[PDB]
Write a protein that binds this ligand. Structure first.
Ligand SMILES: Nc1nc2c(ncn2[C@@H]2O[C@H](COP(=O)(O)OP(=O)(O)CP(=O)(O)O)[C@@H](O)[C@H]2O)c(=O)[nH]1
Lengths: 673, 141, 62
């Protein structure tokens, strides 16, 4: 029974730079349609059969662009929202590159045409010049700012005027304003020329002076959008309510259905990585991608999944091929217009959520157990900022682990580990505003009382002076039998990192002054003392010890007596050897626009960052600097402030250098206190 | 050539490749390609001997094309070439680095009068006398 | 109570829902309960093909 063709499905993302107006445009959509959300659209003139629009509203911030990446990958088409005043933003370029990576056929909506400085054609030219795109206006704005009244449809060559009294639910077709007729004819010819380029037949008609029909123009522009050759540009502004309705008609006319998109690539679970495809059909084996996990207070884990092939029912044991885990599907609803119609028939093209999946993560493939496939995996970027989180109480201690676990499950770009040296829980994320939201959820949804600090710098200990002839004599001949042990050691610094063990032991015992059986106990006594340095109780590194002189007693000498002597000798020698506190240094790489370059280093200089050099790149300059871990905290948001949000840094542990005398001494004193 | 707004005289070498990292300086608050440079220098490299950094300019025209401004291996690195002792700068007056004859520069001043442009071959000799003592040299026949 | 960790190397991170079983080790006074290395936070332990039921390892590949 032919019900609603999958060719009527529009799986679309609304994507924009932070602060551009995209969910208000979506709220306008829901109002006009009748209502991840499903909506139904029949056209602003009711000229279309009912189309199913599944909308994913993607975050504007770059701290949550990981969600945008997941969405873009799982979606068919996109609506790119631009501010008429601000135009193409640095963050728009990031989202534009992500949509290019996934080859998402997309259109453009120039919103905020009611604000001061609104300029449609300026934004069209910025899409061309900054994004390297081919923008083709479908519409022209009638007026600007407070004088914005409507739009010209360049396909129909008519003005669209929306009724302000019904919030734009009704519209009239008018003749083009007399001051715009010349400009409308110019852009109509540019639109027809852009349509004619879609095929040799349409190019011959156009060059022959034959007028293209509205159906040929629409079909030709659709083909090129699907090919990602052009971006169709629409305009309009809500509040007075304009554009959205005609942008939704452009979604039907020009954006892909699930059958217009290439088959999804995957790998067979045969151990040979055999390539396979899944076509957008109900008659194919079931395959779906889990793309979002949300924690719900009432139903538990919601796993959002997009079906690409086949059909599944609410309550169907499928196979999580990625995690090799048979997962019985839970309760599955669907946002049928306003209601949440529980669907027991998730067909190809549909987006739904399952309740109570246990071993499913974002990026997992859910498939038919009799036809295993792994759909292509999501690569998750490495976290760029880390902070220490400490529980206030012991109730908060266990609760913290639980809360952070849930947050790491729903958001892979969020990492949590315990630092083995500090025993602090370290949390890491895709920016500090990202970490701020994570902390807020932890101390609200889960209400876990925690302090936010900085990852403790891994302080080390070493000497800066050879000391010779250091006597250690454990002579405890008391309490029954005596315990005699006597060693003489030299202590000397090693070059930093010259020994992968951080420690050298030289046995230079001559004359059997110490029996060879006790020499391992002396070394073990030193190695235990290396774990807790005599200066501040940090591990001692980059040190050599030569045992060359010693003495035993035939009855009273013990293995651990010589280990006690070794510790005495070590503690006395270490204090004489001018002990110092060490530091880690981090190799930092910053990618920035050439005009923002200066600011980056100004701050890095205050952060004790020894700028090694620079590699002027295409974006601008790739500056390299040696910056202490202590000064590499809170840099994500600071960089975002200096560079207006167009810079990305990386950092790696470089080497164990010497902390500046001031820094080292200050910490030594604080630790002693 | 063009205005002094697309002016950085640079290029210590050609085989070290990229003139953007430390090796090649500048490339800051200016904006231009980097591999689009040494290819015209690749038809130009094999006349210059290495160890002799030649000053050329990234002169960018108004239509995105840029080539270089050839001015021959100069005073400083030829006294690290024709004498045989490198930079060592700072000590003209402390200890003896090297004395250079009168005619040892005049034979390469004809090469250096295509590098230095005040007037003449003889007239540029007393500025080969310049940076030599800043490198630390002394000069007498 | 104080529990005991079986196997020879765990997968622990100090906040981990682990399961408890009876049994006194006779060697640590005050440790009276074993853990299960096959249940809920301790997977099939490393490098073992015999008595797989204890320490929870599944049967090997072939
Ligand atoms: N006057 C006017 N206001 C608009 C229009 N479109 C949106 N707005 C308003 O702007 C705001 C829209 O949210 P905005 O902050 O700009 O977008 P965003 O930050 O990208 C959404 P998110 O937080 O999910 O990233 C709302 O206050 C909305 O009422 C418009 O066309 N005209």
């Amino acid at each position: 029974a032919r019900t609603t063709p999958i060719a009527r499905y529009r799986n679309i993302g609304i994507s924009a730079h932070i602060d551009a107006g995209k969910t208000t445009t979506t709220e306008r959509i829901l109002f006009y349609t009748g209502v991840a959300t499903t909506a139904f659209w029949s056209g602003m003139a009711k000229q279309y059969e009912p189309h199913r629009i599944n909308i994913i509203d993607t975050p504007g911030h770059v701290d949550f662009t990981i969600e945008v990446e997941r969405s873009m990958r799982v979606l068919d088409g996109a609506v790119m929202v631009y501010c008429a005043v601000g135009g193409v933003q640095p963050q728009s370029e990031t989202v534009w590159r992500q949509a290019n990576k996934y080859k998402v056929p997309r259109i453009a909506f120039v919103n905020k045409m009611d604000r001061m400085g609104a300029n449609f054609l300026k934004v069209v030219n910025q899409i061309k010049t900054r994004l390297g795109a081919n923008p083709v206006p479908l519409q022209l704005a009638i007026g600007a700012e407070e004088h914005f009244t409507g739009v010209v449809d360049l396909v129909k060559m008519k003005a669209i005027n929306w009724n302000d009294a019904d919030q734009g639910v009704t519209f009239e077709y008018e003749d083009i304003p007399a001051d715009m007729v010349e400009l409308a004819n110019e852009w109509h010819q540019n639109l027809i020329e852009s349509a004619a380029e879609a095929s040799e037949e349409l190019m011959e008609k156009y060059l022959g002076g034959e007028e293209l029909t509205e159906a040929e123009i629409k079909g030709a522009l659709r083909q090129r959008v699907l090919n990602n050759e052009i971006i169709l540009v629409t305009c309009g502004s809500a509040f007075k309510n304009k554009g959205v309705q005609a942008m939704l008609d452009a979604v039907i006319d020009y954006l892909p259905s699930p059958v217009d998109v290439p088959a999804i690539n995957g790998i067979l679970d045969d151990g040979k990585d055999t390539p396979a495809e899944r076509h957008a059909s109900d008659d194919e084996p079931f395959s779906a991608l889990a793309f979002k996990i949300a924690t719900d207070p009432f139903v538990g884990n919601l796993t959002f999944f997009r079906v690409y092939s086949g059909v599944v029912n609410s309550g169907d044991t499928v196979l999580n091929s990625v995690k090799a885990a048979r997962e019985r599907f839970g309760r599955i609803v669907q946002m049928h217009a306003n209601k949440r119609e529980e669907i027991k028939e998730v067909r190809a093209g549909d987006i739904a959520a399952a309740i109570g999946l246990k071993d499913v993560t974002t990026g997992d493939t859910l498939c038919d157990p009799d036809a295993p496939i792994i759909l292509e995996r999501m690569e998750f970027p490495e976290p760029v900022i880390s902070i220490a989180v400490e529980p206030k109480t012991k109730a908060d201690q266990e609760k913290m682990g639980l809360a952070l676990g849930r947050l790491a499950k729903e958001d892979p770009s969020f990492r949590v580990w315990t630092d083995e040296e500090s025993n602090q829980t370290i949390i890491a994320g895709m920016g500090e505003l990202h970490l701020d939201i994570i902390v807020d959820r932890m101390k609200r949804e889960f209400n876990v009382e925690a302090n936010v600090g900085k990852p403790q710098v891994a302080y080390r200990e070493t000497i800066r002076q050879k000391v010779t002839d250091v006597e250690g004599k454990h002579a405890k001949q008391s309490g029954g039998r005596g315990q005699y042990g006597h060693v003489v050691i030299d202590m000397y610094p090693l070059e930093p990192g010259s020994n992968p063990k951080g420690y050298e032991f030289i046995n230079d015992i001559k004359g059997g002054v110490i029996p060879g059986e006790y020499i391992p106990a002396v070394d073990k006594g030193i190695q235990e003392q290396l774990k807790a340095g005599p200066l501040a109780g940090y591990p001692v590194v980059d040190m050599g010890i030569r045992l060359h002189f010693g003495s035993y007693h035939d009855v009273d000498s013990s293995e651990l007596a010589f280990k006690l002597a070794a510790s005495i000798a070590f503690k006395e020698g270490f204090k004489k050897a001018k002990p110092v506190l060490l530091e880690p240094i981090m190799k930092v790489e910053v990618e920035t626009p050439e005009e923002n370059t200066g600011d980056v280093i100004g701050d890095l200089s205050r952060r004790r960052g020894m700028l090694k050099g620079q590699e002027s790149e295409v974006t601008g300059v790739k500056i390299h600097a040696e910056v202490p871990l202590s000064e590499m905290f809170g840099y994500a948001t600071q960089l975002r402030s200096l560079t207006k949000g167009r810079a990305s840094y990386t950092m790696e542990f470089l080497k164990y250098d010497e902390a500046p005398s001031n820094v080292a001494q200050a910490v030594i004193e604080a630790r002693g206190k | 050539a063009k205005k002094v707004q697309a002016y950085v005289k640079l290029q210590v070498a050609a085989g070290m490749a990229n003139p953007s990292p430390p090796v090649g300086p500048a490339l800051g608050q200016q904006g231009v390609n980097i591999m689009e440079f040494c290819k015209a220098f690749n038809a130009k490299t094999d006349s210059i001997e290495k160890g002799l950094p030649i000053p050329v300019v990234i002169t960018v025209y108004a239509d995105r094309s840029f080539t270089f401004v050839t001015k021959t291996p100069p005073a400083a690195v030829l006294l690290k070439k024709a004498a045989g002792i490198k930079s060592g700068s700072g000590k003209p007056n402390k200890d003896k680095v090297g004395k250079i004859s009168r005619a040892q520069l005049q034979e390469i001043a004809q090469t250096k009068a295509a590098d230095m442009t005040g007037a003449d071959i003889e007239a540029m000799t007393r500025s080969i006398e310049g940076t030599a003592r800043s490198m630390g040299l002394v000069v007498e026949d | 109570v104080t529990s005991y960790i079986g196997g020879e190397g765990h997968n622990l991170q100090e906040h981990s829902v682990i399961l408890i079983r009876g049994g006194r080790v006779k060697d640590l006074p005050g440790v009276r309960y074993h853990t299960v290395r096959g249940a809920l936070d301790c997977s099939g332990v490393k490098d073992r093909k015999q008595a797989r039921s204890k320490y929870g390892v599944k049967r090997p590949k072939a």
